Amino acid sequence: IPVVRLKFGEVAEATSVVVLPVCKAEEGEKKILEAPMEIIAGGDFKVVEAEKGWKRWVVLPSWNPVAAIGKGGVAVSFRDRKVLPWDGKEEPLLVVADRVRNVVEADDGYYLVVAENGLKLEKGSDLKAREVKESLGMVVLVVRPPRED
Amino acid sequence: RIPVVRLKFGEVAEATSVVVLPVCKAEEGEKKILEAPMEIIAGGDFKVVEAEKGWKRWVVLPSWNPVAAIGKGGVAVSFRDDRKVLPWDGKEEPLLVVADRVRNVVEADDGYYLVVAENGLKLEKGSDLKAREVKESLGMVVLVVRPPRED
């Protein structure tokens, strides 16, 4: 379950890049259910065509787990909420999920579900004990902000 | 003056910086171009595009100088392949024209601009548009993208 840093052009096995619709985690499950499901690149310039309009979009490198999704991919934004105001703030995060694989099946796996306010990730095994069989989608990759020195 | 670039196969996957633009098919006329989102500047740590109205058709280009410079108002307009008179010479290439909708007011004499055509849309020269007293256009042409060929 890869936690990678945003850098472009260094997945030297990739011919393309990947375009995803984005949701705010704070905005809840409706938006995630509504984001376009099919994003189809075609033509000489790989013009991408969703089947439905959407306002938020993101480009990511064709990382192995990102490119495997195809149908149902979405990117979800998480922001931070520290007790001590002088503590180093935890980086914002971009969680890539697979809505087609919404079915809880891997005990190791991690799934996106509704939180008291917003969304949260939860381990497969924890969801089974909680009697949940349907999540909003399998977490396939996490993106941390670009970094250097 | 106007940069005309050929995209190489694999060039956007090899780029270290990238821009997303909303696409309009030229044949679909000006209603579509006016509808395209304007606020397409990529923000946050992840360069998430957060537009003002939803849009289904997008394209990723390497962040070339003139494309990055546009900011708000950028759009890429597809022109499909026209049939040549002699069919065995193949189709004439598809084309992406990248326009600056913020700079629609006709100002450059050697600049080029997107105006309404009978068949869809045309590029017209700034000097020419000034002579006909056309003050506004659909957008200043900033860049032309030729598709990747074999040879």
Swiss-Prot record, chain A:
Functional description taken from the UniProt entry: Required for assembly or stability of RuBisCO. Acts at a postchaperonin step to fold and/or assemble the large subunit (rbcL) into RuBisCO. RAF1 brackets an rbcL dimer (rbcL(2)), leading to rbcL(8)-RAF1(4) complex formation. In the next step, RBCS displaces RAF1, thus resulting in holoenzyme formation.
Record's subcellular location: Plastid, Chloroplast
Entry similarity comment: Belongs to the RAF family.
Protein name as annotated: Rubisco accumulation factor 1.2, chloroplastic
Recorded domain comment: Has 3 domains, the N-terminal alpha-helical domain, an extended flexible linker and the C-terminal beta-sheet domain. The N-terminal alpha-helical domain stabilizes RbcL dimers and RbcL dimer-dimer interactions, facilitating RbcL(8) formation. The C-terminal beta-sheet domain probably dimerizes Raf1. The 2 C-terminal beta-sheet domains are swapped and pack against each other to form the dimer interface.
Region (C-terminal beta sheet): 1-146
Domain of life: Eukaryota
Known partners and oligomeric status: Homodimer.
